[PDB]
Design a protein around this ligand. Structure first.
Ligand SMILES: N[C@@H](CC1CCCCC1)P(=O)(O)O
Ligand SMILES: [Co+2]
Ligand SMILES: [Co+2]
Ligand SMILES: [K+]
Length: 304
């Protein structure tokens, strides 16, 4: 394998971390290949669940807990901390909230969060690498509570960063929020990529094509599929009671991606930086509820 940039994996990984049995587990947790029967059973379906009031309560709670765990991770970001140390903290913070760390064993993913540095687009695996001053690092948190998943992510700066890092991360955050601002009943899911791409392209960045936002509730990934680039062909129209994420990945160079031999880590083919932000959203009768928002503080971590 020819690496696309300066990043490398830092092995060995710690043996996988157990979750106590009193924590309720998603189906794939105990499947030998980490397959989710319940997702596979809706593979190829375009139909979007209309959440009940009970379902909405469940999503509100797990998403608030997921935000709390993200905040824990944001607190740890400093030069010299390893990504594995972040993941260990995350793992304990999930268990403390009586939640299962959704990524753990999802299709045999080895860790309890995703940590994506610099040219990593998404799904980086926490490992023994200490964060370096000038890195950008995204932490993606997904929790499972009482049969509901909640999903969010933010990009952080490690110490002082360059102006290019600042612009990339600001633009990516703006892309997400412009999309969110458009969410309401009657909007086609395909429009959001037109919005994102327009803002990315205006700032000289490209938009990853291979990974999309997604429905989420009882399943971690389900309908709708939500592309982040323009002129996509996504199926569906927003209605009150839909829950889904929007999670644009924006790049300094070209949009093309490839995957490391680990089967997870997605990197820019050119080795240039990429940043991401993610929220889980509920469509209401007039607009949307950002389930993973901060309740206590006006701005994402990288501004603060
Ligand atoms: N939270 C992320 C999913 C995660 C699935 C579990 C295994 C690692 C990637 P994503 O839906 O890409 O935001
Ligand atoms: Co995520
Ligand atoms: Co997601
Ligand atoms: K990145």
């Amino acid at each position: 394998y020819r690496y696309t940039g300066k990043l490398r994996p830092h092995y060995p990984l710690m043996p996988t971390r157990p979750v106590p049995s009193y924590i309720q587990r998603p189906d794939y947790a105990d499947h030998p290949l980490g397959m989710s029967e319940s997702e596979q059973a809706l593979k190829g379906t375009s139909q979007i669940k209309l959440l009940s009031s009970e379902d909405i309560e469940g999503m509100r709670l797990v998403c608030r807990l997921a935000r709390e765990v993200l905040d824990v991770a944001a607190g740890m970001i400093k030069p010299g901390v390893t990504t594995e140390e972040i993941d260990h903290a995350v793992h304990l913070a999930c268990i403390a909230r009586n939640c299962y760390p959704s990524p753990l064993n999802y299709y045999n993913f080895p860790k309890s969060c995703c940590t994506s540095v610099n040219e990593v687009i998404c799904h980086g695996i926490p490992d023994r690498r200490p964060l370096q001053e000038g890195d950008i690092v995204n932490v993606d948190i997904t929790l499972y509570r009482n049969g509901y998943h909640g999903d969010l992510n933010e990009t952080f700066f490690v110490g002082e960063v360059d102006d290019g890092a600042r612009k990339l991360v600001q633009t990516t955050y703006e892309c997400l929020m412009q999309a969110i601002d458009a969410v309401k009943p009657g909007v086609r899911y395909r429009e959001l990529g037109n919005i994102i791409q327009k803002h990315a392209q205006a700032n000289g960045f490209s938009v990853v094509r291979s990974y999309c936002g997604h429905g989420i509730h009882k399943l971690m990934h389900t309908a709708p599929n939500v592309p982040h680039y323009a002129k996509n062909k996504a199926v569906g129209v927003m209605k009150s009671g839909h829950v889904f994420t929007i999670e644009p990945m924006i790049c300094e160079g070209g949009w093309q991606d490839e995957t490391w031999p680990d089967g997870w880590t997605a990197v820019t083919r050119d080795g240039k930086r990429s940043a991401q932000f993610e929220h889980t959203l509920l469509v209401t009768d007039t607009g949307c509820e950002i389930l993973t928002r901060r309740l206590d503080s006006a701005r994402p971590h990288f501004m603060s």
